[PDB]
């Protein structure tokens, strides 16, 4: 048995891993069956609804349909940071800042890197920023997400 705060932060870490893998099943497994994710536009401190995802199936579909799939040699990193945690009994609230970066790996030349090529080859770009607010509750073996709010600080377009 580890500290509740660590178990809760572990859930957040598993969330980012699933996010960057675009793994709907790993993502959904972190939530209570009936949990909702409210995604909102927080530019200028607004609270305009982008999408409300009700239940695990809705979450699974959104992992595919609401963010770009990774094309060849692409990845992402969801840099969650500055967590604030308040635990009161069997419920907790976690607020974290987040910033998502796109990662695009250069193709490795068949003839090798030319003389004078050093360091990472590719592009890393910050592509989203905002805050997560998670409500968690206990389960027998740890903690699960019972509700989540995603606040975006850039406008989000869907094609």
């Amino acid at each position: 048995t580890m500290a509740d705060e660590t178990i809760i932060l572990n859930v957040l870490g598993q969330y980012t891993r699933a996010h960057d893998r675009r793994d709907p099943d790993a993502m959904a497994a972190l939530f209570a069956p009936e949990a909702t994710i409210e995604i909102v536009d927080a530019v200028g401190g607004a609270s305009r609804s982008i999408s409300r995802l009700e239940g695990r199936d809705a979450i699974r579909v959104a992992v595919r349909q609401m963010m770009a799939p990774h094309g060849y040699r692409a990845w992402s990193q969801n840099v969650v940071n500055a967590p604030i945690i308040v635990i009161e009994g069997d419920h907790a609230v976690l607020d974290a800042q987040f910033m998502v970066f796109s990662i695009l790996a250069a193709e490795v030349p068949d003839g090798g890197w030319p003389t004078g090529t050093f360091g990472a080859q590719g592009r890393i770009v910050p592509i989203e920023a905002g805050q997560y607010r998670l409500t968690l509750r206990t389960v027998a073996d740890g903690w699960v997400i019972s509700a989540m709010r995603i606040e975006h600080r850039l406008p989000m377009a869907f094609g």
Copy 2:
């Protein structure tokens, strides 16, 4: 009652929230009345004074006068990371890396995003980097900042 380390990390998280909101009163409330912030130039491992802020009023004014206000649809994210915490009784020292990013949201067109527009619209740029060193002490309900050092790893200009 939560672990002291969590309460201390919660203070750091409230600091970043106040920083990015440019909220002088939320910022000042995290400090003991008489606390000082020493802001220093650490480029090349120097320790050249930029500003010494003595007491809450000085801190409040600096929130406005030492960093850019957010113009329309602008925000920031203070990405604190890699904390090291040492608690000895009723005092603690916390060292964190920090990197501040500017966020500028694009204006949403009245006619909507044109067909083929996907993802976040705007610009995110890393604009400061360094380390924070906080000295904290206990109060009845938790922990407060009794002293802080801000080390910048880029030169800072003030107009």
Copy 3:
């Protein structure tokens, strides 16, 4: 005595400090004498070996020979984030996302910044991204790294 999770996260923080200082001795001191670092190419979920560093001397040399030295007024920040920690008795595993940024400070003009110059002067660029997986074990005074895996999500070139 602090919580084991804090002591373990403190090791990670000392790792980033040593990394950014390019301090081989501070880095090596975090590892058991016989520890290995496996550095691997994880682009596309591969696991292709880049380098295997066996023991402290190998680690010390790699701090110099496997990443760029800091030239004048240069620095870096190793932004570790989203840790997941599992402790089972006297062993622990820690997985963290990481992103390294290069920092290049502008030279300060002898005549001072021209009128209208505001904010940080220089360049901050994301230059590496991936995951760290550390195995730690107890020692009398805390925890040491017994094995480490570094997974890079960009191809790495060595000249």
